[PDB]
Design a protein around this ligand. Structure first.
Ligand code: HEC
Ligand code: HEC
Lengths: 106, 53
């Protein structure tokens, strides 16, 4: 009876460390608005973080450091996990297209 | 078919796709059910990535 998914759940979030959560809260406090977003528009930092806890990193069951740099969430390159972030952005655009012009016909 | 032609092997070459050349199937989303268990209920996906816009 998850309020997001039909028959799926992510709730036992043992895959997210405590330092990741502390960094998330600190970044939310220090930045009310997102600093560098190209796909997710019309959302605050808190909403983006909630999305990245529930559906991103909760649909793959990975940690916040799989794609990001914990020190600075707005950083784009300089760490060995930037290609993952690029692929994730492309997969967001693909999902938008897929449910925008193919499941809207049902 | 669109997923195969656009994101798996765009232009006929696997190297340009965002997947490791893994073609989709009906079972990939529907894991034995008529509605995929990982499908999001209406109003739960960021509006920019939904069917409404
Ligand atoms: C790879 C699947 C990721 C995981 C794991 C996490 N995030 Fe993420 N994040 C990802 C991408 C591709 C983007 C860019 C979105 C865009 O439109 O360009 C982001 C962005 C954020 C942001 C926004 C910060 C900013 O733009 O300045 C935040 C605050 C954020 N992500 C938080 C966050 C947290 C807390 C995570 C662990 C639960 C996490 N992300 C994981 C991809 C991925
Ligand atoms: C993930 C990208 C999927 C792929 C691959 C396939 N389907 Fe699917 N299907 C998907 C969603 C998100 C939904 C629900 C959308 C909605 O608005 O209801 C569906 C639904 C169906 C249905 C309807 C089931 C019903 O009870 O009415 C059918 C008959 C269906 N899908 C068929 C189908 C076939 C034959 C596929 C392989 C060629 C296939 N789907 C793949 C998501 C995804």
């Amino acid at each position: 009876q998850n309020p997001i998914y039909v028959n799926y759940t992510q709730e036992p979030t043992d895959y997210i460390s405590a330092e990741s959560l502390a960094a998330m809260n600190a970044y939310i406090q220090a930045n009310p608005q997102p600093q560098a977003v190209q796909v997710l528009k019309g959302m605050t930092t808190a909403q983006i973080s909630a999305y990245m806890v529930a559906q991103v990193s909760g649909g793959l069951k990975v940690d916040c450091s799989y794609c990001h740099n914990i020190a600075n969430f707005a950083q784009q390159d300089g760490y060995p996990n930037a290609a993952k972030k690029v692929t994730a952005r492309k997969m967001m655009l693909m999902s938008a297209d897929l449910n925008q012009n193919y499941t809207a016909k049902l | 078919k669109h997923i195969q032609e656009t994101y798996v092997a765009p232009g006929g070459r696997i190297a340009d796709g965002i997947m490791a050349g893994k073609s989709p199937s009906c079972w990939l989303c529907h894991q034995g059910a008529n509605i995929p268990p990982g499908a999001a209920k209406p109003g739960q996906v960021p509006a920019v990535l939904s069917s409404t816009p």
